[model samples]
Target: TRDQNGTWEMESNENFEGYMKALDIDFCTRKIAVRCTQTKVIDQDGDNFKDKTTSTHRNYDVDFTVGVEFDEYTKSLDNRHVKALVTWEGDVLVCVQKGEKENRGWKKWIEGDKLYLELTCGDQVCRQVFKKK
Candidate 1:
């Protein structure tokens, strides 16, 4: 299995605004989000995992177990309530969110010294990459 636990700092982000738009984020919030760097902290112990999306503008945190669905309110981001489930497919952790947005969720995995992420909402996707610190 790949080591996905670490403090990863943002390197480059592609199409963040597009995905945010799909999530129905407001114009002012999208502008602020794009300008801020995202820092991710991930830790896994067996089937339980915790993730924190941190930034100067806002932060979001979640704790969940594999194969179990949980209530996730996208508090600072979109502020929508959704049912989220996370599962391990090979070495990648794939997450699916069931909500008003279609085909929404994110995928996270580590390759070499970098942790990669793809955020999805509606038909828009955002690629956010980070380097291990």
Candidate 2:
């Protein structure tokens, strides 16, 4: 139902540093990450989805099913392992990541021509908006 099959580039970020701090990221990584313009390329087919998140400093690839849980290694971003599950909530795609950290997850929804990503870690929440490319 949700069509997330396109390229999206970052437009704005809110509380990104706070979310990175909650992940216990290093100073240099945070510095580079803050300045980097992140992009997401998503390929969706039925209930299966593959996503690639790219930036100047690093990149990450994730493959998963909508109603199934999968193991994920967060590579350059925190470098942690987690069990991730994605599901649909109305028109929004909600992801829950369970691991060493508490209250970590993300929500993706499209509003008109823009795509919104809300990333959460502990009490910190980072809202990143992206425009379709």
Candidate 3:
């Protein structure tokens, strides 16, 4: 979605990682994110869509159709081999990552014209906001 500036920003943010010791995400991976930036670039090509997440430490790319099933990898966060899928619920984009942790996943919703993301992994939660450009 585009606004007057041809960009949309996330209106809210939320995230979770259980507890520090519970995730077992490794020190190196966690340490790399300090002051690091995560950027998501979306390419909407009719029925085919792509999402790219880029950061200083690593990058992830995935493609999925609206209802079609696909697989994804979470390399940057935990470097774990997990089965992931995404779908659209109304105006929100929902993603569920199935892996070691219970209730581990994230959700994204658009508020007005802003982008909101919520990440969860066990008990800890983290929130993030992004402005579309």
Candidate 4:
């Protein structure tokens, strides 16, 4: 569903180690993180939204709205701040951050009650699927 609040369990996660490497996760932490899969929970209402990425190592929360630009503070990955717009591409909503890095962005959408995420950064592209339980 395009507009719904739900909790999704990790069904498939591909290239997370590479993605974490792209995100500056070192050899030590990366191994531990990959052993623990992540869960995605979305709290959304219309245009405003907050996403929770849960895992054993730690947790991450990304908050944004549909039509606004948010700044990304790339500290370890790269010492740069970039702007990104969360906009719609047909039925798919993706955020492409324009920067000097290899390419950074994500395409997130719901299909068949499954939340799909395609993450891109530095030399890595990760595909993650979460099915609603």
Candidate 5:
């Protein structure tokens, strides 16, 4: 089993602007987002988990359980109402966020001392890498 309890610092991002644009993020916010550094903190307890996506400009908090759907309000990332369900696919944590937009979700995986996050919106996908901190 994968133990996802650690702090990860952002290393690099790929296609982030495309993904953010798909979410309809404003020009100024998108500019800040692309330039701002991010840290992802995750606390996992059995089937429950809490993830805090922190940055200098904004912070997002998300708490959810495996296999249980819950209402989620995306704070700074293109504020939207979503029904989110998280599940484990082997060692990867896959989250499906159902919302007004089609194909919106994220996936998390850890490899060695690096953590990988993939964010999807519409047909655009953004890949972010973080090093364990």
Candidate 6:
């Protein structure tokens, strides 16, 4: 993550077994992921957005804009490349990633005092909840 153009510093990650598996994680790695947790912090500046993924193992940063298609290279995510587009649907943010996996993407919505995130990859779908701080 970057603050004031300074050097990026590593951050701690948390539970991410299913997320890693969705990206073709190895069995050995999956076993160790039980002790891990991953946190994603997104910074939005108008149409441009910067997303940061922090975990116990690695840190990932992604930046993009709505309705714009771009090639996303996720090194921590098995170094996979995919074309993705994000849009606003209702009061939620929806992303559609066209790639090797079927129906892969996520939806983020704010409901009351909490934030809801739904992620889909192949036949596996995961739901995560975040409280407003």
For all predictions, the C-alpha RMSD in Å is: 16.2, 16.2, 16.3, 15.4, 16.2, 14.3
- Per-residue accuracy of model 1 over 1-133 as CA lDDT, tens digit each: 7668889999899999999999999998897889798889999777788999888654677889999999999987788989999999999999999999889999999999999999998889999999988
**Full-model lDDT for every candidate:** 0.91, 0.92, 0.67, 0.82, 0.90, 0.77
Per-residue C-alpha lDDT of model 4 across residues 18-66, encoded as one tens digit per residue: 8999999889988777868667899998889999988854334567898
TM-score for all models, in order of appearance: 0.58, 0.58, 0.53, 0.50, 0.58, 0.55
| Candidate 4: clashing pairs of residues | none
Alpha-carbon error at 17 in model 3, in Å? Answer: 31
- Poorly placed runs, candidate 6 (over 4 Å): 1-58
Best of the candidates, lDDT:
2
Native RMSD of candidate 1 (Å): 16.2
Lowest summed lDDT across 10 adjacent residues in model 2 is found at 54-63
Better of 4 and 6 by TM-score: 6
- Candidate 3 residue-wise lDDT at 128: 89
For the record, the alpha-carbon RMSD of candidate 2 to the native fold, in angstroms, is 16.2
**Model 1 TM-score, 2 decimals:** 0.58
What is the RMSD, in Å, between candidate 3 and the native fold over all Cα? 16.3
**Could you tell me which 10 consecutive residues in candidate 4 have the lowest summed lDDT?**
54-63
Candidate 3 positional error at 60, Å: 2.5
Clashing pairs in 6: 12-55, 13-37, 13-55, 13-56, 14-36, 14-37, 14-38, 15-36, 15-37
